[PDB]
Amino acid sequence: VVISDAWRQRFGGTARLYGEKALQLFADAHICVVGIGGVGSWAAEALARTGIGAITLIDMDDVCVTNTNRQIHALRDNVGLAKAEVMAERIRQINPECRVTVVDDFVTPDNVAQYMSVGYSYVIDAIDSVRPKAALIAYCRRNKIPLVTTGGAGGQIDPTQIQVTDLAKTIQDPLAAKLRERLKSDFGVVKNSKGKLGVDCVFSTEALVYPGFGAATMVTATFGFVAVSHALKKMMAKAARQG
Amino acid sequence: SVVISDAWRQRFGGTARLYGEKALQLFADAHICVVGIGGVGSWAAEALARTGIGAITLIDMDDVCVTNTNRQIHALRDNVGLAKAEVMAERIRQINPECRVTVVDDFVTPDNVAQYMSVGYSYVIDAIDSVRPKAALIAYCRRNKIPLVTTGGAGGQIDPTQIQVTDLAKTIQDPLAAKLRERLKSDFGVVKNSKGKLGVDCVFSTEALVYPQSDGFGAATMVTATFGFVAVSHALKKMMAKAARQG
Ligand SMILES: Nc1ncnc2c1ncn2[C@@H]1O[C@H](COP(=O)(O)OP(=O)(O)OP(=O)(O)O)[C@@H](O)[C@H]1O
Ligand SMILES: Nc1ncnc2c1ncn2[C@@H]1O[C@H](COP(=O)(O)OP(=O)(O)OP(=O)(O)O)[C@@H](O)[C@H]1O
Ligand SMILES: [K+]
Ligand SMILES: [K+]
Ligand code: NA
């Protein structure tokens, strides 16, 4: 992608933070966000606001009033529209030059290859249900597709306990635990000699608050923001190693 | 006092399930002021609206600029040139049409701070980036025991997991916080106490600053928004703790 003057105006602050090479790297990147909800809608926003030049959004759910407490697209006039389309329209308002694709579908074990094989720079997995989540992680891991997944973000109030570690090492996260169990039984994914699954997971050390679970923007959005920052760090590091 | 509607419970049922029923009403009855609707404050304002805060005041007189796009939730193609506080207020009304939103189209000064703080806020979130008015706001809220959380510099930082809350005296790697301490002392007589604390809660990051990489500091949504989100979570926790302690 050739960066226009308007793009340099919008993302001058990105360039001043990450550098010119990173700005170009981001403009040339294509990142996929799967699940445009409490975590993924903010991830998508952050990607757009950091000069990522191409974004794919995968979700088939609509905006509901009950999303209001934790999803950036949940506004009165958006209720009943497709989440992914509302977020795509917002991204075009953030960066009119971003290449935005909507996949109006849910990821399944049956279709993940079709969806994941377009060649993404990174995949951010913000799915809440274990079966498709395991199928997505297993596929990206096998195919060496850069992935960051997110554990359970509900039932938590403290954004400062969010961190990234190998999926094998998460604690206080029942979703991540169920995911490990399904990866093992259904996909043969098991931890290596060093006790790692080779899957990066955003999780929180906070113990869950039972009232399903409630949620707050301040936590669920930070899950998405930490996923994006982690992906960009890994992308920049890889680019720095080439040469 | 706000009567919580059935629509409010649809919007904020997840808030009640997380913080509790008493908290839902506490939030609906609260009036929180966000000073500075920029890289930090615009996301704080968003988070307050989405957590069922019943009245929000926004204080800023700046306009949306295309260069805000990297880090401010209101920075959209069609908002460029409009007043930030008014754009953000209209958004809050779309989030919660029953939220009482007040716009103060002004900057805080030593001359006007008492008037603007005279409404009796449940909490003040200080997201000012300029030291002069920041010091005046902090000194006033501190003297008057007005609940306040301030934010250091969120620019020049890339790692959201290093953001935390501490006493303003103990921040590191934050030149804005450093200048602010100096102005508080020289202009307002605010100095640290026996325990070395200023008695002001400050959001900062332990991350070392990243200096400008092209042609001041750069910034990213993932960090500046998390400053605002950590500030809101801290304020809501302190409000809940105070309500529980009355009893
Ligand atoms: N298999 C899948 N592929 C892609 N997206 C998915 C899949 N399964 C779920 N999603 C989406 O992931 C998102 C998760 O959002 P989140 O957990 O914040 O709450 P929600 O599902 O919108 O609300 P609620 O939990 O009350 O139904 C949702 O938008 C959902 O539609
Ligand atoms: N005295 C004040 N009273 C109220 N709001 C203020 C005051 N001083 C500054 N602010 C606001 O704090 C916000 C800070 O935003 P941030 O530092 O992320 O970038 P910015 O200042 O918007 O960028 P730029 O300086 O390039 O326009 C601004 O919107 C500014 O108007
Ligand atoms: K947890
Ligand atoms: K710092
Ligand atoms: Na942290």
Numbering used by the authors:
A (entry chain A): 3 to 213, 237 to 268
B (entry chain B): 2 to 216, 237 to 268
Could you pull the original sentences from the published paper?
The enzyme responsible for t6A cyclization in E. coli was identified by comparative genomic approaches and analysis of LC/MS data sets of genomic deletion strains (ribonucleotide analysis) as CsdL, subsequently renamed to TcdA, for tRNA threonylcarbamoyladenosine dehydratase A. TcdA is an ubiquitin-activating E1-like protein with detectable homology to the adenylyltransferases MoeB and ThiF. To further the understanding of ct6A biology we have determined the high-resolution crystal structures of CsdL/TcdA in complex with AMP and ATP, an E1-like activating enzyme from Escherichia coli, which catalyzes the ATP-dependent dehydration of t6A to form ct6A. The tertiary structure of monomeric TcdA consists of seven β-strands in a continuous sheet surrounded by eight α-helices.
The asymmetric unit contained four TcdA chains arranged in two independent dimers, with a solvent content of 39%. In the TcdA-ATP complex, ATP is bound in a cleft over the C-terminal end of the central sheet. The residues in the P loop form the floor of the nucleotide triphosphate moiety, and the adenine ring is inserted into a hydrophobic cavity. A short hydrogen bond between the main-chain carbonyl oxygen from the P-loop Gly40 maintains the α-phosphate group firmly bound insite the binding pocket in a kinked conformation. Besides localized changes in the active site, the TcdA-ATP and TcdA-AMP structures are identical (RMSD 0.16 Å over 246 Cα atoms). The TcdA dimer is maintained by Na+, which mediates monomer-monomer contacts through the dimer interface, and by K+ ions, which play a structural role in shaping the monomer fold.
